[PDB]
């Protein structure tokens, strides 16, 4: 009864995910093994900042928090006030093809791109560096949707959403993670780390003709 | 008293009993002069002053206090705490954790000016949330005056745990005015700086019994200076914190000094 979305996420540029060698502020790392992992939050937190500009900001939306979002947003990710459900979880993930990144040479698993800062009064260089994960890095992926019985704080009790409400929601995952690929994932504010490229998207059970009807939306990324 | 506090919002408890009060007159007169002074008017006097110290003079040390090493910025900013019963041997005060922990020493600095080095005390101060129940708001702070009453000198205090058990002279001098008056003062001028840095620090004081923690100590220390701050006083600011690391009791005072700033914000 679990609508499991499998997948595989792969960047093509660097990727700078803050984490708060004498590196100044390194990437987030899986602290048993220190491999670079994708944090579960900034998947959820990028999308609810993209989709609060796409489903929003058509219809003259100020949207001054994730609390005054539209219903189609708070259906998926939850909030304080109405709180439809916490309906979209994002299974956190770490780098996958590590030994196959080694076997084709890249041994560092993080380069340190040196940088620069030219002041415009003296043309004095000010060196600086960030860490980026490898452009060839290929994380595994999952996030789990469900058969989704609703929990109304509102008086419309036990209102289980219908099959039109699923495909308005899996429009928003087609509209979510495709619109991600034309924007960031991590750091480098408007500077080139976070062009990502999804592979092998699916939905999976964990009615029957609804299953093929949802994968369509997920061939659309 | 948890609805206003810039910083943490924790209701602070305080209980404190004057030690050895059964020996107040049975053996408190008969060590000097072989005890000819035991009389009723000489023993109804300190029990006529304790009916003012612990019953009326505590209104002075609370309504307009003196010592303010956490809050500061006003001399007569009133203590926002509330005393449960002002009476006799035992004082019981509960308020925010901030005003209590200064006043809990400050009232004792209206106590060592009366006995002047003869009567001893041990207190207890803990911090608790608002909806915390009373039946374990007095069974755990009954270890904080239960562990520093088990001091060999009996004149001490225990903060937040039975492993912090410090003397009254080791607390206002070594902890706050030496070590807490070291930490938050280099970025006194940058008052909003990373306390997200300082909770890295007292991981190391728990792993101080390993060798490379010396290396990681100085490592994180000079992970704060650079070209974006005034670095006229940084070599000693880490060296004071570097000499404190090696001694197996210098850092015992330090953990409480670190805890004061993260719980102040």
């Amino acid at each position: 009864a679990k609508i499991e979305i499998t997948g595989t996420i792969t960047v093509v540029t660097g990727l700078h995910i803050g984490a708060g060698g004498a590196v100044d502020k390194p990437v987030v790392r899986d602290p048993l093994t220190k491999w670079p992992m994708i944090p579960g939050t900034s998947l959820k937190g990028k999308v609810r900042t993209l989709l609060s500009r796409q489903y929003g900001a058509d219809t003259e939306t100020f949207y001054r928090k994730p609390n005054d979002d539209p219903a189609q947003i708070r259906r998926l990710f939850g909030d304080t006030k109405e709180y439809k459900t916490g309906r979209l979880v994002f299974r956190d993930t770490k780098l996958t093809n590590k030994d196959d990144l080694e076997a084709r040479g890249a041994k560092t698993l993080t380069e340190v791109k040196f940088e620069n800062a030219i002041n415009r009064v003296t043309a004095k260089a000010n060196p600086r560096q960030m860490e980026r994960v490898i452009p060839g890095s290929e994380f595994a992926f999952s996030l789990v949707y469900e058969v989704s019985f609703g929990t109304p704080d509102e008086e419309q009790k036990a209102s289980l959403p219908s099959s039109d409400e699923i495909i308005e929601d899996f429009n928003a995952i087609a509209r979510g993670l495709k619109l991600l690929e034309l924007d960031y994932l991590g750091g480098s504010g408007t500077r080139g780390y976070g062009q990502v490229k999804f592979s092998d998207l699916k939905a999976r059970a964990a009615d029957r003709s609804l299953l093929e009807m949802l994968n369509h939306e997920l061939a659309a990324v | 008293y948890v609805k206003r506090a810039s910083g943490i919002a924790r209701l602070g408890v305080l209980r404190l009993d004057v030690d050895n009060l059964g020996q107040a007159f049975t053996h408190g007169f008969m060590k000097q002069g072989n005890g000819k002074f035991n009389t009723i008017s000489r023993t109804a006097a300190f029990s006529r002053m304790l009916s003012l110290f612990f019953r009326q003079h505590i209104n002075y040390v609370l309504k307009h206090p003196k010592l303010r090493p956490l809050t500061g910025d006003d001399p007569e900013r009133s203590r926002r705490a509330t005393i449960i019963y002002s009476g006799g041997d035992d004082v019981f005060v509960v308020g925010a954790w901030d005003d209590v922990i200064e006043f809990g020493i400050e009232l004792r600095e209206r106590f060592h000016e009366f006995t002047q080095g003869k009567l001893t005390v041990s207190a207890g101060i803990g911090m608790f949330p608002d909806k915390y129940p009373i039946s374990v708001m007095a069974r755990e702070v009954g270890d904080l005056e239960g562990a520093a009453k088990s001091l060999p000198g009996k004149n001490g205090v225990a903060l937040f745990d039975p492993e912090f058990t410090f003397r009254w002279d080791e607390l206002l001098s070594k902890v706050i005015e030496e070590k807490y008056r070291h930490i938050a003062d280099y970025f006194r001028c940058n008052e909003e700086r990373g306390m997200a840095f300082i909770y890295k620090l007292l991981e190391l004081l728990d792993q101080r019994g390993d060798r490379i923690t010396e290396a990681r100590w100085v490592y994180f220390l000079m992970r704060m200076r650079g070209p974006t701050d005034d670095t006229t006083r940084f070599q000693q600011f880490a060296n004071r914190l570097h000499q404190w690391f090696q001694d197996p009791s210098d850092a015992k005072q330090l953990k409480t000094a670190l805890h004061l700033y993260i719980y102040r914000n």
């Binding site: 060698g21 600086r128 | 290396a215 990681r216």
Partner: protein, 120 residues
């Protein structure tokens, strides 16, 4: 032993050319960002004697050292004053000396960070 205490003084023994140091840490950036990844593949491997893939990961770290020191003025003095190549010839038994050696190098760059201004 002495080896985590040695680096307290061998960095005072580095010859500072202008009074400021000659060995800034960025000259080791291809080195200390190549052993930090060796340090984390070492301990996560559970056998004492190293995996054969990690037997020759340090082989490149050894060869990088003898090049980078011979490439620059500053690391020309820093290797033998710490005895780094002197520790690296015999490390092919087990991670015990290796995790000592990386910890030794951890103390060095930590004490190198303390014994200089070393701004960002």
């Amino acid at each position: 032993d002495d080896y985590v205490k040695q680096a307290e003084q061998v960095i005072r023994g580095l010859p500072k050319k202008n009074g400021d140091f000659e060995l800034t840490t960025t000259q080791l950036r291809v080195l200390l960002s190549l052993t930090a990844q060796l340090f984390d593949e070492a301990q996560l491997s559970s056998d004492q004697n190293l995996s054969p893939a990690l037997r020759d990961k340090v082989q490149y770290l050894r060869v990088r050292f003898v090049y980078q020191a011979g490439r620059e003025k500053a690391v020309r003095v820093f290797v033998e004053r710490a005895g780094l190549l002197d520790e690296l010839a015999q490390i092919g038994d087990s991670r015990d000396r290796l995790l000592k050696f990386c910890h030794y190098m951890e103390a060095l760059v930590a004490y190198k960070k303390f014994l200089d201004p070393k701004e960002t």
